[PDB]
A paper describes a structure:
The spike (S) protein on the surface of [name]-[name]-2 exploits [name] ([name]) as cellular receptor and mediates the fusion of the viral and the host cell membrane during infection. The activation of the S protein requires the receptor-binding domain ([name]) binding to the peptidase domain (PD) of [name] and the cleavage by host proteases into the N-terminal S1 subunit and the C-terminal S2 subunit. S1 consists of the N-terminal domain (NTD), the [name], subdomain 1 and 2 (SD1 and SD2). Here we report the cryo-electron microscopy (cryo-EM) structures of trimeric extracellular domain of the S protein (hereinafter referred to as S) at multiple states and conformations, including the all [name]-locked, activated, S1/S2 trypsin-cleaved, PD of [name]-bound, and the full-length [name]-bound states.
To investigate the effect of proteolytic processing on the activation of the S protein of [name]-[name]-2, we digested the purified S protein by trypsin, which is referred to as S(p) hereafter for clarity. We solved the structures of the S(p) protein in complex with PD of [name] with overall resolutions of 2.9–3.6 Å, which show different PD binding results from the uncleaved S–PD complex. Three conformations of the S(p)–PD complex were observed. In conformations 2 and 3 that respectively account for 84.5% and 6% particles, the S(p) trimer is bound by two PD molecules with the remaining [name] in “down” and “up” state, respectively. The binding of the second PD to the [name] of S(p) in conformation 2 induces shift of both the NTD in the same protomer and the anticlockwise NTD compared with conformation 1. The trypsin-digested S protein tends to accommodate more PD molecules. Based on these discoveries, we propose that the cleavage at S1/S2 site might affect the architectural rigidity of the S protein, making [name] more accessible to [name].
Author numbering:
A (entry chain A): 742 to 826, 854 to 940, 944 to 1135
B (entry chain C): 298 to 621, 640 to 676, 690 to 790
C (entry chain A): 27 to 67, 81 to 143, 153 to 172, 187 to 247, 264 to 297
D (entry chain C), E (entry chain B): 988 to 1037
F (entry chain B): 742 to 790
The structure:
């Protein structure tokens, strides 16, 4: 407001404590920016490391695992992300966690999940081979385990080829991170560009009102500048509170996704991608986080004809965990998400009642 | 200073911004470009033959660099009076035109060259207006203008019909007519030739010897500018916070050699957001960058007065060589009063850029906080870990539901039981209605807040 | 005749260096794609707010301008001349020939017939542009000399004009003329209006491109 | 002349009051998010198993 | 004489508009938190079983 | 503020970019209201019958 001039500084004392409030507000929002990062990324107690010999059943994580010959020991995809996105009384404070520390945190999360599944987010990490973990995750979406073990190489090739396309699509999209940078810079520039308005005075310089006016006449002209500059500073401080309350909710959602998609398997629909959630991987970005969601999507459907129950010996039979289907002439049981027909026996069905209350029973 | 900033006698552990550090500017400097046309007065003040008193000369000095100091201190002048403006402030002002009038008079006639006089010289030879502005200079010239036998070439007018208007000039030579009788261009009683001649002779008493006079008259019409003093220029130092003025550009900062290249008509350079960041020195014509004098907040790190009274100090983003033991440089500033160790602990007091401080190793020290203990998992492709026991854990989680419902009467806060103030407050409209409506809506929300958390059950079960 | 400027008559609004910075200004400019008079070889023109003025030749037929309100005595005027020697700025009260010029022996200067009360003196193919303006008793002159590869037609392109002179006269101006060297042995006139432009600054600090922000919706 | 002095007090105190009310509105919105989260935890952690 | 009064009118009318815009900003962030809850409900209660 | 008058516009020009900020603030709000609706309702690839 004054810029090191005792005349303006004494007039300013008449306004009370507005400028202790403004500083309190800005300090309160600069502390919560470090609180925001701490709750997204410090979700581990140990720093887990991955084994030197990396055989994960055909799956290849080399583009998301840390690279020692790179800057800050980042992964290959964490680099594509960091490449894509002094004044008067204004300073910028550094964040408490460096970028090296945050890349360390994400590599510990990523080595915990590649190697222990979801066990490290509930206690001590317990190792399990990667394909058996993949089979547990297939169980979690309602497919049986033999469907993973008999299609291992195909599922691994699809995963590798789909991780290879993230790298192209990014190397060739971070608009939500660019916008928060742009908004803050556009506001800081508007703050400085106001130091050159009169607000109804003879000039914008205090060394020009203190040079062609006597002290009784320069008070009236200095107050017109003080009022304007106070207004502009307080507008800046209100809009930052309103923008920080929005960044806070985004970081609160990121902290929930790190818990529920990276340290677990979610059943919520469309919370960890589109499809059936299998697993998620975190990557650090300039002022945020990227999640890579791996999901299962069913494909290549056929129609069959169905019945709710089967009548036999006067009894009604229902499938234990499947659907009754007909290929035109014969009746089988499948599981509901993957076609794998079986002979209807008394081991995959159960009985209740007689076959005249259900509507749609078939004889078989 | 921390106790004063918090307004308390017990400070709890933390880190507190307490004041600011601002490097002062040792001295100040000015500058300008060499001079060329400093005005060659050595023609009007150094002529071989002056001009009569009845036809004075009139030189119109113009756009130039005038140095009235070489005049003022020359000590060769017997009379140097300044009227509109005292002499020492001439080399610090600028006008539109300077006129210089020159002539030669007797010695004791120099007191009629002044505003508001009378006598044969000021009446009708050379009249100065009554609000004169310039200066009058005069010096004896007996050896140049007076010659044995009498120098009869210096005339003056001794008869005129009416006194001159100021700065008016009259070189006519008509036969004067004193009496009523017409003259018809011939001399006689009451018909006189109007010009007389000083017969100067070298053996004349002072006050009878010739004096040469120059009258400088500064005028200010209504142009855009013109000649003025020769604004000198002092030296210029660099690499020090300084208070500078570059022919108009007033500022503060450190000056440094540049490596940019202006175009040869550009004086100073500006940044985006429009702040001067380079200048060109008028005299030597070299580009110099202007960086601001180091400045930054000061923070105090304390373990808490209930533990110790030692303290460490952070000068924020200041290079630790320009602060005014343990001086330690951080990406966040210069830290004084803590020692740097090589261990890594859990963060205690956050300094920044990965550095924390603690009161451990009875003192204070800095270090790069640790993220946690390292752990390799015994991964292989046919190994599994299965737990054989369990624990039951109970942990707490705390959440704010509500806050204090407060209301303010907008009128009683501002005026407080005064009708003179209340009627003037009516000229702003519905500000207080708006304020009460805003505050009441957030008092209603607080009861909804706790109804939504606690009344989630229909019956009161026992 | 009349012709169309394309992007012509851009001058550096003032000192102060500058680099790559699409800087925005409000000033008196010659709008893009304007209607500029054409003259061949001349008459008394108006001034009313600054003037753009280009000219083309290898010889030197254009030998300065004359300015003022009445171009005679009873009021003051400027006179800017160039014989085969060098420029001669001058400010007196004159008596100007209603058709003033200079010859080419090589004896010349039937320009005026009076030089009274002088209040300022000074003494000492091709495309030669000039911008003349007159604000607060100062008469500013910007100029630029580009080489054409034609002889006498207005070309196309971008070239910013650098300030030349500054004269604290005080003179009023409402009219101006031109001066030509006769035969004894092409020029244009734009006018300036208050516009807003967007200037692109190079890394050396020169204006390389501009945008007139009132031409069309894209601008 | 009482009026010219009273108007500066009115101007300053109005601005004080407006700053107080704006910062209460921004803080009540933060308390509401907390109370919505606590309602969701009461439903999903006390009245069920998550 | 008139510029003095017109500056008072301007000051009042600019204060009113700032009050209006700040409250619209605070009220739109409340509508956004509600549309976010609606999007999650449409995903999780209409496109699946919760 | 001013509203038609011209003595008002030159006086208000002295306050800087106070009015540009307010129009930016209101335009952001209006662009957010369409994204609210796109996020709630356009949650489907095809138009099923
Ligand atoms: C995992 O995939 C990467 C591809 O991103 C493989 O690494 C590259 O393979 C190509 C083809 O042989 C080589 O030209 C590159 O030099 C490899 N290294 C790079 C690009 O850094 C990697 O071999 C795969 N892992 C396994 C076990 O097959
Ligand atoms: C399932 O059977 C239906 C019934 O024929 C198929 O749907 C029809 O497909 C034909 C050809 O694509 C269309 O012309 C009809 O309009 C469809 N609808 C009807 C007849 O109601 C469908 O293609 C079959 N699905 C699969 C996966 O084979
Ligand atoms: C439905 O599937 C059954 C498979 O059980 C098909 O019947 C068998 O088909 C094979 C090859 O055509 C024969 O070798 C068997 O003898 C058939 N019967 C049995 C009991 O296995 C039947 O053709 C399929 N129907 C349709 C319409 O595709
Ligand atoms: C399914 O099987 C039952 C028993 O085999 C069928 O019931 C018989 O249906 C015939 C023809 O309607 C009657 O004449 C018999 O009296 C029925 N017997 C009994 C015990 O109900 C039944 O019709 C079969 N369903 C279909 C669709 O063929
Ligand atoms: C301003 O004056 C100074 C001297 O007062 C000039 O400095 C001279 O610079 C030349 C370099 O070409 C040296 O050879 C001389 O020895 C210098 N003289 C002195 C006394 O140091 C300076 O060049 C002048 N400014 C300009 C722009 O020419
Ligand atoms: C007129 O010219 C003379 C000679 O150039 C100047 O006289 C010099 O005065 C200085 C200071 O009093 C002396 O140091 C010199 O010795 C003088 N010159 C000579 C040759 O001895 C005189 O200053 C000039 N007058 C004015 C008004 O500038
Ligand atoms: C299905 O609809 C058909 C009509 O095409 C009807 O004959 C049959 O009884 C219906 N069956 C069931 C189970 O609804
Ligand atoms: C504070 O002081 C009390 C009594 O002097 C002591 O019991 C307590 O441990 C102290 N707290 C700390 C953090 O040292
Ligand atoms: C402080 O200044 C010295 C002297 O130039 C320099 O060596 C040092 O690097 C500066 N500090 C930092 C943090 O660069
Ligand atoms: C910390 O370790 C480094 C190893 O490079 C060593 O050079 C340095 O002297 C150590 N610091 C102290 C204080 O011992
Ligand atoms: C310039 O204006 C004159 C005025 O009549 C018009 O005749 C002429 O066509 C215009 N020239 C251009 C290029 O628009
Ligand atoms: C050129 O014209 C000026 C105009 O007065 C004149 O002073 C000068 O002497 C002329 N050049 C020559 C060589 O006469
Ligand atoms: C201008 O010239 C005329 C005629 O030569 C003369 O009457 C007048 O006094 C002059 N102007 C001034 C200011 O002397
Ligand atoms: C220029 O002419 C105008 C005519 O309206 C006159 O009012 C003004 O005083 C003149 N300029 C000067 C500097 O006198
Ligand atoms: C001027 O600019 C050109 C191109 O922008 C650059 O190559 C050159 O180094 C600059 N400086 C000069 C020519 O002195």
């Amino acid at each position: 407001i004054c810029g090191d001039s005792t005349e303006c500084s004494n007039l300013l004392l008449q306004y009370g404590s507005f400028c202790t409030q403004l500083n309190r507000a800005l300090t309160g929002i600069a502390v919560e920016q470090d609180k925001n990062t701490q709750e997204v990324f410090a979700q581990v107690k140990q720093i887990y490391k991955t084994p030197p010999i990396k055989d994960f059943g055909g799956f290849n994580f080399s583009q998301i695992l840390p690279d020692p010959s790179k800057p800050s020991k980042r992964s290959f995809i964490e680099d594509l992300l960091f490449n894509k996105v002094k004044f008067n009384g204004l300073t910028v404070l550094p964040p408490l966690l460096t970028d090296e520390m945050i890349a360390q945190y994400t590599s510990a999360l990523l080595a915990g999940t590649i190697t222990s599944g979801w066990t490290f987010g509930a206690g001590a990490a317990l190792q399990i081979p990667f394909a058996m973990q993949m089979a547990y995750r297939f169980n979690g979406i309602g497919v049986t385990q033999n469907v993973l073990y008999e299609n291992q190489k195909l599922i691994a090739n699809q995963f590798n080829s789909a991780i290879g396309k993230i790298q192209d699509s990014l190397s060739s999209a971070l608009g939500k991170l660019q916008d928060v940078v742009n908004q803050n810079a556009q506001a800081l520039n508007t703050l400085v560009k106001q130091l050159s308005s009169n607000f109804g005075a003879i000039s914008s310089v205090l060394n020009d009102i203190l040079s062609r006016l006597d002290p009784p006449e320069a008070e009236v002209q200095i107050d017109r500048l003080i009022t304007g500059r106070l207004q502009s500073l307080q507008t800046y401080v209100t809009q930052q509170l309103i923008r920080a309350a929005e960044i806070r909710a985004s970081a609160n959602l990121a902290a929930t996704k790190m818990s529920e998609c990276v340290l677990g398997q979610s059943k919520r629909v469309d919370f960890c991608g589109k499809g059936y959630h299998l697993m998620s991987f975190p990557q650090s970005a300039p002022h945020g986080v990227v999640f890579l969601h791996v999901t299962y999507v069913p494909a290549q459907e056929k129609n069959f004809t169905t019945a709710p129950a089967i009548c036999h010996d006067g009894k009604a039979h229902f499938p234990r965990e499947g659907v009754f289907v007909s290929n035109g002439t014969h009746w089988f049981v499948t599981q509901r998400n993957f076609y794998e027909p079986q002979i209807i026996t008394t081991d995959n069905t159960f009985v209740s009642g007689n076959c005249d209350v259900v509507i749609g029973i078939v004889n078989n | 200073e921390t106790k004063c900033t918090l307004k308390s006698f017990t400070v709890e552990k933390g880190i507190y911004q307490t004041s600011n550090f601002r490097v002062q500017p040792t001295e100040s400097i000015v500058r300008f470009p060499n001079i060329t046309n400093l005005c060659p007065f050595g023609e009007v003040f150094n002529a071989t033959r002056f001009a009569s008193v009845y036809a004075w000369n009139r030189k119109r000095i113009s756009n130039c660099v005038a140095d009235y100091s070489v005049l003022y201190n020359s000590a060769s002048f017997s009379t140097f009076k300044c009227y509109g403006v005292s002499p020492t402030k001439l080399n610090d002002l600028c006008f539109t035109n300077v006129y210089a009038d020159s002539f030669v008079i007797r010695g004791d006639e120099v007191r009629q060259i002044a505003p508001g006089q009378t006598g044969k010289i000021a009446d009708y030879n050379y009249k100065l207006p009554d609000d004169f502005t310039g200066c009058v200079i005069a010096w004896n010239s007996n050896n140049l203008d007076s010659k044995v036998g009498g120098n009869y070439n210096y005339l003056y007018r001794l008869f005129r019909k009416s006194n001159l208007k100021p700065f008016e000039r009259d070189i006519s030579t008509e036969i004067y007519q004193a009496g009523s009788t017409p003259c018809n261009g011939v001399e006689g009683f009451n018909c006189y030739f109007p010009l007389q001649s000083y017969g100067f002779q070298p053996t004349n008493g002072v006050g009878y010897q010739p004096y040469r006079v120059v009258v400088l008259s500064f005028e200010l019409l209504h142009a855009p500018a013109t000649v003025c003093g020769p604004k000198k220029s002092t030296n210029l130092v660099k690499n020090k916070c300084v208070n500078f003025n570059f022919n108009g550009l007033t500022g503060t900062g450190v000056l440094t050699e540049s490596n940019k290249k202006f175009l040869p008509f550009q004086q100073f350079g500006r940044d985006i957001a429009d702040t001067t960041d380079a200048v060109r020195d008028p005299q030597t014509l070299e580009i110099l960058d202007i960086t601001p004098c180091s400045f930054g907040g000061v923070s105090v790190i304390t373990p808490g007065t209930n533990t110790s009274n030692q303290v460490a100090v952070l000068y924020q983003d200041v290079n630790c060589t320009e602060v005014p033991s343990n001086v330690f440089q951080t990406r966040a500033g210069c830290l004084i009063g803590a020692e740097h160790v090589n261990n890594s602990y859990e963060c205690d007091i956050p300094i920044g850029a990965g550095i924390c401080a603690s009161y451990q190793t009875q003192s204070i020290i800095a270090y790069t906080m640790s993220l946690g203990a390292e752990n390799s998992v015994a991964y292989s492709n046919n190994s599994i870990a299965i737990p054989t026991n369990f624990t039951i854990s109970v942990t707490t989680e705390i959440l704010p539901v509500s806050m204090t419902k407060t209301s303010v009467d907008c009128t009683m806060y501002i005026c407080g039981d005064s009708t003179e103030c209340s009627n003037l407050l009516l000229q702003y409209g519905s500000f207080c209605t708006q304020l009460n409506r805003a505050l009441t809506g957030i008092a209603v929300e607080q009861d909804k807040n706790t109804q939504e958390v606690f009344a989630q059950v229909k019956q009161i079960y026992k | 005749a009349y012709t169309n400027s394309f992007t012509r008559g851009v001058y550096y609004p003032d000192k102060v260096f500058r680099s790559s910075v699409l800087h925005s200004t409000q000033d008196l400019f010659l709008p893009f794609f304007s209607n500029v008079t054409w003259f061949h070889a001349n008459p008394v023109l108006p001034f009313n707010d600054g003037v753009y003025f280009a000219s083309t030749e290898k010889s030197n037929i254009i030998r300065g301008w004359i300015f003022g309100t009445t171009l005679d005595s009873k009021t003051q005027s400027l006179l800017i001349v160039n014989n085969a020697t060098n420029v001669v700025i001058k400010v007196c009260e004159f008596q100007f020939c209603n058709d003033p010029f200079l010859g080419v022996m090589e004896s010349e200067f039937r320009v005026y017939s009076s030089a009274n009360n002088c209040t300022f003196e000074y003494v000492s193919k091709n495309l030669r542009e000039f911008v003349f303006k007159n604000i607060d008793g100062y008469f500013k002159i910007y100029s630029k000399h580009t080489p054409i590869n034609l002889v006498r037609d207005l070309p196309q392109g971008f070239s910013a004009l650098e300030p030349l002179v500054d004269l604290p006269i005080g003179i009023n101006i409402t009219r101006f003329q031109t001066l030509l060297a006769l035969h004894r042995s092409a020029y244009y006139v734009g006018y300036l209006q208050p516009r807003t432009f967007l200037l692109k600054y190079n890394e050396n600090g020169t204006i390389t491109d501009a945008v007139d922000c009132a031409l069309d919706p894209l601008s």
